[PDB]
Every structure is written in C-alpha cells, then in structure tokens.
Amino acid sequence: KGFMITSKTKRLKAQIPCPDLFS
Amino acid sequence: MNINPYFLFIDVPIQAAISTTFPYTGVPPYSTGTGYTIDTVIRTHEYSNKGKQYISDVTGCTMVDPTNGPLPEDNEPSAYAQLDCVLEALDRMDEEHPGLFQAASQNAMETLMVTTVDKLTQGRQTFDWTVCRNQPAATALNTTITSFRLNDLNGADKGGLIPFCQDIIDSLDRPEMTFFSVKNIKKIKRIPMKVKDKITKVEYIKRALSLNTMTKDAERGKLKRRAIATAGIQIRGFVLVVENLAKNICENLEQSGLPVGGNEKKAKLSNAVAKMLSNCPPGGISMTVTGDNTKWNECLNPRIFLAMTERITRDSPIWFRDFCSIAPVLFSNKIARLGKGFMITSKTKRLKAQIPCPDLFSIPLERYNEETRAKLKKLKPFFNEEGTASLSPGMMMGMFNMLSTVLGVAALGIKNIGNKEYLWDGLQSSDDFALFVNAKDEETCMEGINDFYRTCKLLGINMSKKKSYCNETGMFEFTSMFYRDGFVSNFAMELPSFGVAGVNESADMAIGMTIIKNNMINNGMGPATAQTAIQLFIADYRYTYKCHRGDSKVEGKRMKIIKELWENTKGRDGLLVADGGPNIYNLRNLHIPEIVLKYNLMDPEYKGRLLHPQNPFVGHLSIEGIKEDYDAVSGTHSWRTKRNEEQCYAKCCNLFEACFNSASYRKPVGQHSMLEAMAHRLRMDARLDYESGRMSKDDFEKAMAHLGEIGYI
Amino acid sequence: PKYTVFRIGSLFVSGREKSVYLYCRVNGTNKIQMKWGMEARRCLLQSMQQMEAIVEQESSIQGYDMTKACFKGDRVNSPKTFSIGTQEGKLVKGSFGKALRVIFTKCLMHYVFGNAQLEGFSAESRRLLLLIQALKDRKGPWVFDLEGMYSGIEECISNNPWVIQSAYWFNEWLGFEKEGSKV
Amino acid sequence: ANMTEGKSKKPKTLAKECLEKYSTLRDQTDPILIMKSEKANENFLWKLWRDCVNTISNEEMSNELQKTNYAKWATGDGLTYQKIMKEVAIDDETMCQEEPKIPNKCRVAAWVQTEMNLLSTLTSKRALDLPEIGPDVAPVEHVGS
Amino acid sequence: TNYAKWATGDGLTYQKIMKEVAIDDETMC
Ligand SMILES: [Mg+2]
C-alpha cells in the first residue's frame, strides 16, 4: 500500500505508494 | 534626471493643475460593515455621553439626550446644542427673510395635499419590515400596502398621501400586526412562499423605527469607510414632506442658494467673493476660511430638527404642524440594525464561522480582537437583545440634508458677536461650508473666525480643525470647487465612463451623444476633450454591439452580415454605425439623431428595411422607457431585453394598457371600476370588428358570452 | 519579494543575447476591480482636459490659438517649457510634450497603484498643496492645527509604492519651493 | 512580438501563435529557479505554468485548464477554511477572531523613480488607436482637431 | 446530527489529496 505523509498545518493527508517511495 | 511630477506646480498654480492631483482613474475603495456600524454608534454616543440617559418606555431602548446639556470644555466634537441658541439663529433668519417660513410651509402643505401614495415609489432601496431586508421602493410600498389590507388599514386605496400616512401612524397602535413573510421549505429544493406571519406591537414599532445599515461603497477621498443607512416606508412620506419644506426654505436663502447644479456653482462662488470684497471696509482685510466638517452628522440631534420644524411652521394648521413633526420624532427614536456580524476562525482546525449580530455577546469577549473587544465592551449598554443598537443622538448621512443646510445657514447668518469689529458670511451646502470674515486687521479676522467656531459649537455644528484652513480672500475651495483670483477650477466631478448605457443600439447612441453634448455645455468640456470623448464612446459602442466598420478585418457572427451589407449597399456613408457604417458625429451635430443625420445618404432599400413600418424588432410595451431624456427614432434597432401581487398588478396593468393605448401616455380619468370600463370597451371593439368583417359571428358570440360570464351584459 | 521567478530562456532582440525570466505570482481581484481596470482609458481624457486648459489659458492671453505656439512655438512666442525633474540638485526643464507624458504617466500610476491609501493620501495632501499655494502668493495663510493635518496625511503612508514616492517627491518640491521663497 | 496582417483573432489563437513563433521558450520544460519569494511552491507554480502552455497550445478551442485538480491546490484554492454552523463556533473555545493585519511600514524604493522615468518616454511602438469622427466644418472643431 | 459531527470530532478529518500534489509539496511528511 505504501506509506502515508501528512501536513498538520494544512490538515492534509496523502498515500505514497511503494513504487513512489523514493520520489 | 529624476522626474518629479510635483515640479509642474513650480510653473503652474496648484488650482490649475488640481485635476491631476485627484485620483479618479483607479478603483474606488470598496469593502463586513458590522464593525463600522458599531464604531459609528460608539462615536455618536461618545459625543453625547454627558447628556441625559433614560429608558424609552415605548420601545425599552436606552436613550441619550445631549441637547441643552453641559457646554463643551475641550475641542472634541460636541452634540450639546442649546435650544435657545438654535431658536435665536432661526429667529434671526426669519427676521432677515420676511415671510419665508410661512411661504415655505404653505407651499409644502399645498404640494402634500396633491401628492399621492405612488410618490413613495421614487428613491433607492428601502428597508422592508415584512422581510427585514432591503428592497426597492416599489417592492416595499406594495408589500406594506398588501400587509395593511390584512390589518384593516385601507388608506392606500384612498389615493392621496395623507390617508396612507394616517394609516401608517395607525398601524403603530394595532395590538398585533399580520403580514406576508417569505418562508423557505426544503422539498431537495428550497422553495420560498408567502406565509401569514404575526408580530406583536413592540416588535412592529422596533421594525418601523429601525434603520438598515451597510458600508458606503465608492466613497473616494476617504481612507476608512463609514456606515450608510436606509429607512423603511413608515418614515418615507414624512421625510419627503419635511425635506420639501426644508428645500423651500433653503432655495430662497442666499448663503445656501437654491441647490446649484452644473456651472451655477461657479456663479455662486464668484458672487460670494465679489460681494464680500465689496463689503470690505476701506483699508481692512477680508479672510476666507476653507472649512470642512467630518462626521458632523453624528453631532446633529433629531430633537433640534424637531424644534426647527416647529419654529418653521409657527403659523400653519395644526394638522400640517403635526404631520411635519413626525419625521424628527421617528428619527429621535431610531434603531440601528448592525451589519451581519463578525467572523471567528480557528486555524489549528481550519474552521470559520460567522456570528450573527443577535449573538454578539454569546461568546466571551476574550475571543475577539482587541479593537472589537473594546468596541463591544463600549456598545453593551446600547445593545438590544434582537441584534440591534439604539441610536438616539446623531443623524445618519443623507436623511436631513436640506434641514441641516438650513441650520448651517442659520449659524452663518449671525454675522457678528458682541458688536465686534468684524462681519462674517459664507456659503453652506450639505456638510461643506466656506466662511468669509471682513475686519480691520488679521487679528480681528481671527477673532471673528474663533467666534464663529464657538457659535457653531453651540448649535451642534463641529468644524474640523485638521481639515479647515484660512487665507486672504480671493483663493479658497467649496464643494470641491477651487476659486483663485476670479478663476474657478471645479475638477472633482469624475466624467462618467463614456460607454453605452446598455438599453439598445439607437437609444444608446443617442444617450451617449447627448451626454457628451451636456458635458460640453455644463462641465466646461473643451472641444478636443469632447472629440476624444466621442471617439472613446464610439470605440466602446462598437465593442459592445459587435458593430465594426464593414471595411474592417474584424470577425464575428454579426460582422459577417455587416461585411456583406458593406458591399451590397452602394451608398456607404448613410449606414448607421450599428450596421458597419462610418461614424459622422462631430461637435456640431451632437443633437441630431444619426437616423435623421444619414437619411439623405441612405440607399433607397436600406432606409425601407431599417425603417420598415411593420418589422418584428419593435414592440409597443417596450416604449415605456423611450422618454426616460433622449431624442431618437423607431426602427429595427429599437429592441428590448429579455425578462430575467407582483404578477397580479403587472398583468392587470398590461391588459389595461393593451385595451386602451392612451393609458400608457396620459393618466386615464374616470370614477368607476377598471373592470367595467374594460368590459364596455371590449364590447365596443367586438361590435366594430363584427361590423367591419374583422371578426366572425361565432367569435362575437363567444365574446358576449365571456362578457356575461364577467357579468356586464 | 512577492514574485517567484524562473529562467525560461534567452532571446536575440537585435542580434544580442538577453535572458528571458518568468515572474510568477498569485494575486486576487474583484469584479469591481476588473471593471474599473476596464476604465483605465479615461486616463487619456484626464491627461487631455488638463493640457487643454493650459492651452486655453494661453489662447486667452493672446488672441490667436496658442496650441502651435505652446507646443513648438511660433514667430512671436517661444515653445512652452515646464520644470520636469532634477539632476544633482539642479532642476531640469522639458518641452510641453514631456510634461504631457509625465501627466499621463501620473494618471496611469494613480490607476495602477490605486487603493484606499492612495485616495486618502491624495485627499489629505491636497490641503497642504493649497496651503503652499497660498504661501507662494503671499495670502498669509493660517492653520488652526498643523500637526493634525500632518498626522492625517502620514497615516496613509504605509506600503503603497506610489504614496511613498509621492511623499518623497512632495518633500523635494517643498524644499525647492522654500529655496525659491528665500530668493 | 508576432507580426500580422491586422486580422483580429481570438486571444487563445493569438497566444498559441506567439508561443509557436518562440518555440524554444514554449518547449522549455526544465525550470531554473532564480528566487522563490517566501512560501510559493516552485513545483506548483511551474506545473501550473506548464499546464497553461499546454492548454494554449492544444488543438482544442476551449481555454480551460486540463488538470482542474492539480490547479486546485497549486493556486491555493483548496486551502480554504470550512464554514460551520454558529452553534459549534459558540461552543468551541479555540475559535477566536483574527487580529487585523496592518500594512507594513516601508521606506522609499529606488524602483518607483526608475519606473516614472521609463514609462514617460517615447517608444518605437504605439498601442493607442481610436475610432474616427465626422468631418469638421466649424472652426471650433478644427481647433479641437 | 450537524452538532454531533463536530462534538464527536468526526468533522476534524484530514482531507485526502492526489499523490502528485503531496509529492510536489515539501511540507507534507
Ligand atoms: Mg471644503
């Protein structure tokens, strides 16, 4: 599934798939 | 070499080049107004907080009375106008003008007796209590008339304004008040409909006395905004009569003069300067004070205006004296609706929410910013639970302009204090005044200016010391009009954007040319400026209506047919510009319609097509606006725009006009129902058609059957 | 400091290389702002009325029309000139056309940098301009309070480039006028 | 600059043709950032610019951007607060009123004088064209002309 | 219902955005 990145100030979440781990 | 525009003043007077100093080619400042309205209330009560504070029994609000209060002890604005001083000024004004008050009162009464209810349809957006909103004058008037029928108040049907205003006064006594309110139901669609709602007496009184507020828009020359207000229909007629009385008084006054328009301002300024200079004693000095009052309407009390109305109508029937005393009475007990509330946001949660004004104090004051915190803390005493603030003292802008001008001229007409060695006189108009003092030396002139300042303090009139200055007579400014050495340089009237009025091609062209010519006649527009204005207007006209010269390379839906007409038409200089024709307007022929101007050069078929008597682009009902004034012609370019108890009245009057084409032009006359007259004329029309063969036997039989169904056989 | 600028290429305007950058910026507008921007062309009108008045005055002083005389002169009148700027503390004169262009640019800048600050500054500085004119003509002007007027003018000088540059220019012109008063 | 016979064309077509003439700048797809202001995303702005160029150069005739979702966040539109009913605002003790933002106090800048100097100079190109008016017969219209 | 959305914290949920925007944004981590 990959990892998850988040911005608390903007209150946004996104999922980075495994292929896009190094982008 | 570093360009410095101000250096242009080294070789030219500032007055001559003052036009460039004025920014009138950018965007005027535009705006919530809740903070500004609260600030206006706070300022108005601050200038009156040393007066008398009581509770209005009728409404329960907190009332402040600065009149006859302590005399000012500092140079801050003061509303403590002494009644005796105002009466002194008005008595002096009466003495210098024999029978002006009586003449104005008689004229106002006679005009009131003839004025009808429909006169209230003129004006701007008015407060509608039925919906507690702002709606056009006609909308508010018909809504009030309809809701008065439900309450057994049928004065509107009587015609004249006096019975309608009598029913308005009566409505304040009804224990309840029934009306039609817009209710939105979720059926998901939000459908609005009329519902028979009721409000008790006190709420109705509050609504009638209430004044809707907003932030004034496009007010150039001011860094910060202010609060503009609009009233309801309950005070419109009385305000109209009082303003008529004030205008009747102030047209005769030479200090104010009949409210001047166009280039009469130059004449007024020149006459004032010349008269004062002639009056100047031998070897004396005349000094002109260029004055400016800012927020001077916040120190004007409706009680003082009630006193002026009472004094002006000293010899009049009690009915008119009482009628003229109702606008000040309703303005002294006015209620200020406060904007739309404040907006509070949390950025750790990215949330926002508007706080409606009824709920201003439901939140702890610690959650407002410091300025809003202090504003609300000071506003709390005059806050009403329903989301409004009582504003007894002061007056909102634009309500009593003629009356305030009369008061200012009364202040001007004192002319001296203590038999001192100076005489003062000036011009007054709507918050703007200019003073002239003649004396024997500069010191005495300054003494006279100080005396005038102190006297104005006694009438509630405050003059801005920051905005007012003085110099020797011969150079000053008034109503944004700069006089210098006999030369007047009015350069604050922004020339209206020379673009199509957006009604239709023919009418728009006529309006634009007439506007340019009127500017030339009144506003001193020069030849070259007028020609460039014509060029700009023609450019905008061609851009809006996609009507460029047939010989141009522009493309479009209409331009293809214009190009076709360019070559299919032999006489090329006779085409209207809307048909790709060449413009032939110049300074000399700005007053002749281009339809006539090109009649001789039109091709034989082009005029027939354009002037085809029966062409589909014209309808009778579209002619209402032909008058309002521009001179034009009827033709294919005379079309109208699509339409984006309302429909009841609309269709009834449309049928009334259709049956009788005269009703559109001149008022019909009769003492009977419109229905019976309609039936009779329809019977006559059917008989004429049957006689002339335009109708068949069955059609006339059907018409008679329908008329009998109406019940007029 | 408000522009994110990239370097997108280079050009040969006249056979000489010149870098081509791309200035990127996020801004906001209102329909009223767009409308009033559509009416920037009135600057032209504002820039001609003024000049027309000037010519009219000259045409009043001497019978014949002075437009030709005002712009480039004639047999009996030299061309009109106006003080446009300064260099190294010495004022510089320029033709009527140069003053015309300066007036037009002034109106255009009033439009471009127009907001509440500019309106306030212009309105409040008009009073000081009229007071200075009264001083020049020896009309013996008086002020009921001067610090109030100065504060009202200065409260509008915060961040508008045109207002600040206009304040600088006003100070420079006021110094020049003081020197002229000395002589 | 693109020289043309004078035919008036839609702004989208004009921009497309001007970009086509300068193909090197249009096809530049590797940005060289010179300075990012304080907070602007270089990637957002550059991708938005590339979307603009692609939309202008596309064979279609509509000028609408083809992403409509990346552009939502590139322009900052998506970073907007969400309205909530007044009751929750009353009960939420952390929802306050934003303090007013005061304009910065700045000093004179040397670029305003340069702009004044440069803008009031004659150039080789004029963009001002106005319509025609009818002939002049009176002397007054002659002097106006 | 409208109140219960915020009282229980259900409304305070982070918005999901396309991975391209998140990758282009250096603030997300
Ligand atoms: Mg004034």
Contacts of residue B250, defined as CB under 8 A and 6 or more positions apart, other chains included, come to B256, B257, B258, B259, B402, B405, B406, B409
Cβ-based burial of B439 (10 A; exposed 0-12, middle 13-18, buried ≥19): buried
* Cα B506 from chain centroid (whole Å): 28
Q: Give the Å distances, CA to CA, from B194 to B141, B181, B183, B191, B203.
A: 17, 5, 6, 10, 20
Look up tokens 């950032």; give the residue: D33
B398 annotated to bind ligand: yes
B232, containing H or E segment:
none
Q: Where does residue D10 rank: exposed (0-12), middle (13-18), buried (19+ CB within 10 A)?
A: exposed
Residue B44, both tokens: 């108005």
- Among C20, C103, E18, which Cα is nearest to D44's? E18
Q: C61-65 contacts: CB < 8 A, separation 24 or more?
A: C65/D143
- Determine the residue of chain C that is closest to B520 in CA distance: C49
Q: At what angle do helices B83-96 and B302-312 cross, to 10 degrees?
A: 40
Which H/E stretch holds residue B193? strand B190-200
* Distance between Cα B78 and ligand 1 center (Å): 20
Strand duo B422-429 + B432-439: pairing: antiparallel
Cβ contact, residue pair B2, C123, below 8 Å: no
Any chain D CB within 8 A of the CB of E2? yes
- Cβ neighbours of D111 (radius 10 Å): 9
How far apart, in Å, are the Cα atoms of B35 and each of B32, B96, B613, D104, D121?
7, 45, 59, 22, 46
The answer to whether the CB of C94 falls within 8 A of the CB of D120 is: no
Distance between CA atoms of A11 and B237, rounded to whole angstroms?
57
Q: How far apart are CA B565 and CA B573, in angstroms?
A: 12
Q: How far apart are CA B481 and CA B228, in angstroms?
A: 25
Best of D84, D92, D95 to disrupt the E interface (most E CBs within 10 Å) is D84
Q: Interface of chain B against chain A, CB under 8 Å?
A: 349-350
Cα gap B558→B578, rounded to integer Å? 10
User: Looking at C25-172, which runs of residues are DSSP E strands?
Assistant: 81-87, 90-95, 142-143
What one-character-per-residue DSSP string does B76-138 give?
S------HHHHHHHHHHHHHHSTTHHHHHHHHHHHHHHH-BGGGGGSSS-EEETTTTEEE-HH
Tokens coding C4:
């994110």
Chains within contact range of chain C (3+ C-beta pairs < 8 Å): B, D
Contact yes or no for B274/B288 (Cβ under 8 A): no
Closest CA to B593 of B508, B482, B667: B508
B259, B413 contact by CB (below 8 A): no
Give buried/exposed letters for B618-628 (b at 16+ CB in 10 A, else e).
beeeeeeeeee
Distance CA D124, CA B660 (A): 66
Assess contact for B411 and B453: CB atoms under 8 A: no
Q: Is E touching C (3+ C-beta pairs, cut-off 8 A)?
A: no
Give me B434's structure tokens: 């200019």
CA B245, CA B85: separation in Å to the nearest integer? Answer: 22
- Option in D45, D103, D108 nearest C168 (CB): D108
- Give SS3 for B469: strand
Q: Dump the DSSP string for D68-130.
A: SSHHHHHTTTTS--EE--HHHHHH-TT-BPPPPPPPP-----HHHHHHHHHHTS--S------
Residue matched to tokens 């001559």 = B16
Name the experimental technique.
cryo-EM
Resolution (A): 2.9
E7 close to A (CB below 8 A)? no
Tell me how long chain C is. Answer: 183
List the D82-83 sheet strands across, edge first. B342-346, B351-355, D82-83
**CA B129 – CA B144 distance, rounded (Å):** 8
Q: Using DSSP, state whether A5 is helix, strand or coil.
A: strand
Exposed (0-12), middle (13-18) or buried (19+): which is B496, by Cβ within 10 Å? exposed
Torsion of CA B247, B102, B333, B42, to 10 degrees: 50
- Bridging pattern class, strands D82-83 and B351-355: parallel
Helices marked H in B5-82 — which ranges?
8-11, 18-21, 34-46
Contact between B712 and B674 under an 8 Å Cβ cutoff? The reply is: no
